[PDB]
Amino acid sequence: ADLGHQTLGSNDGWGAYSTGTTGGSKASSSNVYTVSNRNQLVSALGKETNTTPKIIYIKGTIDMNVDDNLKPLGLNDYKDPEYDLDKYLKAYDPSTWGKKEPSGTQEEARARSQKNQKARVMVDIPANTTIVGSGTNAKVVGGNFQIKSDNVIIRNIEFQDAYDYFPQWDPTDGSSGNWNSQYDNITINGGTHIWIDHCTFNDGSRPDSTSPKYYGRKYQHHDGQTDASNGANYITMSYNYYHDHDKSSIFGSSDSKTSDDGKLKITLHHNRYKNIVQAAPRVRFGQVHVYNNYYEGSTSSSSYPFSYAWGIGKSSKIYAQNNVIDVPGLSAAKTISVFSGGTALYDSGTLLNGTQINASAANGLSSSVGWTPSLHGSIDASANVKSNVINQAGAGKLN
Ligand SMILES: O=C(O)[C@H]1O[C@H](O[C@@H]2[C@H](O)[C@@H](O)[C@@H](O[C@@H]3[C@H](O)[C@@H](O)[C@@H](O[C@@H]4[C@H](O)[C@@H](O)[C@@H](O[C@@H]5[C@H](O)[C@@H](O)[C@@H](O)O[C@@H]5C(=O)O)O[C@@H]4C(=O)O)O[C@@H]3C(=O)O)O[C@@H]2C(=O)O)[C@H](O)[C@@H](O)[C@H]1O
Numbered sequence: 072a073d074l075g076h077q078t079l080g081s082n083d084g085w086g087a088y089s090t091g092t093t094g095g096s097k098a099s100s101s102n103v104y105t106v107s108n109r110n111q112l113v114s115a116l117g118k119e120t121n122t123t124p125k126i127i128y129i130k131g132t133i134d135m136n137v138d139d140n141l142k143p144l145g146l147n148d149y150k151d152p153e154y155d156l157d158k159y160l161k162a163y164d165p166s167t168w169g170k171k172e173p174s175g176t177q178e179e180a181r182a183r184s185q186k187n188q189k190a191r192v193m194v195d196i197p198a199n200t201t202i203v204g205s206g207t208n209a210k211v212v213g214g215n216f217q218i219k220s221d222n223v224i225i226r227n228i229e230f231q232d233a234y235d236y237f238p239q240w241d242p243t244d245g246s247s248g249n250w251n252s253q254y255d256n257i258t259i260n261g262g263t264h265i266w267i268d269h270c271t272f273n274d275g276s277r278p279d280s281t282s283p284k285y286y287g288r289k290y291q292h293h294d295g296q297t298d299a300s301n302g303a304n305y306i307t308m309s310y311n312y313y314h315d316h317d318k319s320s321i322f323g324s325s326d327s328k329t330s331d332d333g334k335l336k337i338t339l340h341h342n343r344y345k346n347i348v349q350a351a352p353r354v355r356f357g358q359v360h361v362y363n364n365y366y367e368g369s370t371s372s373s374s375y376p377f378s379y380a381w382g383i384g385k386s387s388k389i390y391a392q393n394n395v396i397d398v399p400g401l402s403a404a405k406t407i408s409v410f411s412g413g414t415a416l417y418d419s420g421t422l423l424n425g426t427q428i429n430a431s432a433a434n435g436l437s438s439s440v441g442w443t444p445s446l447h448g449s450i451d452a453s454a455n456v457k458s459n460v461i462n463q464a465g466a467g468k469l470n
């Protein structure tokens with residue numbers, strides 16, 4: 072079968088659980104589409120009631136920041152008439168405004184401006200859908216795919232620059248505040264039975280290094296690459312190339328969403344993470360199998376300096392096997408970041424800078440997470456992970 076008609080293997084990670092992940096493999100002939108712009112993509116997907124099996128082939132580059140006639144849209148196109156960047160900044164400057172939450176005219180106009188862009192860039196994927204890139208050059212630019220449904224396959228696409236024109240100031244976000252944006256490349260919002268495979272996620276032409284600092288903080292236009300939230304469950308992400316990006320993969324969005332417990336069952340294998348700052352993945356609550364991934368970066372880099380790989384968040388149950396980390400000067404302990412509520416981590420075969428380490432013991436964590444994965448393919452020796460992943464991960468490695 073071609074990539075359009077293939078299904079996730081019956082042993083291939085948490086996505087193969089119960090009914091599994093077939094996407095739109097069983098689609099009838101009038102439910103197979105080829106799309107090369109925003110209009111065609113949106114016609115193809117249709118609405119949430121469009122649940123028959125379907126296959127969607129992406130041909131070339133699809134820019135999501137366009138109008139109904141496909142003309143490029145920008146800041147002034149989305150801008151609420153009452154929004155102004157100068158006046159937003161004057162309004163909420165810590166010096167005069169303090170640490171209270173931004174409110175009043177500018178923030179309200181910013182929130183309306185954001186919903187204007189959102190309406191173009193953000194798109195829901197209906198149940199029983201396969202979306203695959205044709206050839207080696209399928210791209211989605213500015214786009215944020217959202218999956219709230221069941222049974223979706225996404226393969227062989229380069230996702231670039233999920234860029235928010237209206238970042239929000241949060242003075243209470245960390246010790247000196249932060250700017251936060253809304254668009255991921257893919258948001259799995261209560262979505263189930265999902266396979267994301269042979270995709271590439273990057274920040275395109277607008278990396279964070281082209282953004283100014285306001286209030287001494289990076290004016291952050293980006294959010295996640297592949298985030299999972301609100302009871303997302305039964306997901307495999309395999310052979311993806313994540314590079315040149317700050318916050319990659321946040322699984323479980325809130326310490327309060329105790330309902331995520333027993334959910335966020337996600338399998339990450341054979342993914343490349345180059346020049347990613349943090350959260351690869353950051354986990355709350357979930358049984359996440361992380362194996363045969365390769366991480367590479369620099370703590371002293373000028374655009375995307377390495378902070379951590381695995382986030383041990385509240386009640387997280389990460390089971391890590393034979394992952395390879397290449398960050399010069401990094402200690403065994405600093406491969407991960409431990410958050411309150413985080414007490415446990417299984418890891419075996421972890422290689423840091425060519426040396427075998429125990430990341431869990433290095434951090435004083437419990438070595439058992441109360442589960443062992445049964446659904447997985449072959450496990451590479453740590454000694455072959457770097458080669459296998461570099462050669463195989465990302466868009467345009469198949470076609
Ligand atoms: O309005 C809607 O349409 C949506 O509403 C619901 O959504 C909200 C929100 O709108 C979504 O963007 C998303 O956001 C998540 C968090 O609420 C948000 O704070 C953020 O979080 C991460 C991380 O979880 C958090 O701890 C923190 O990180 C610190 C620090 O800020 C960083 O700078 C760094 O030092 O790391 C730290 C750390 O790791 O702890 O901020 C992080 C960040 O991304 O900046 O982003 C989350 C996310 O993107 O998923 O979901 C929210 C939610 O309530 O679930 C609704 O759920 C949704 O369906 C829409 O309708």
Ligand SMILES: [Ca+2]
Pocket residue numbers: 244249251
């Ligand atoms: Ca934040």
Ligand SMILES: [Ca+2]
Pocket residue numbers: 252294295
């Ligand atoms: Ca976020």
Ligand SMILES: [Ca+2]
Pocket residue numbers: 253254255258294295298
């Ligand atoms: Ca997100």
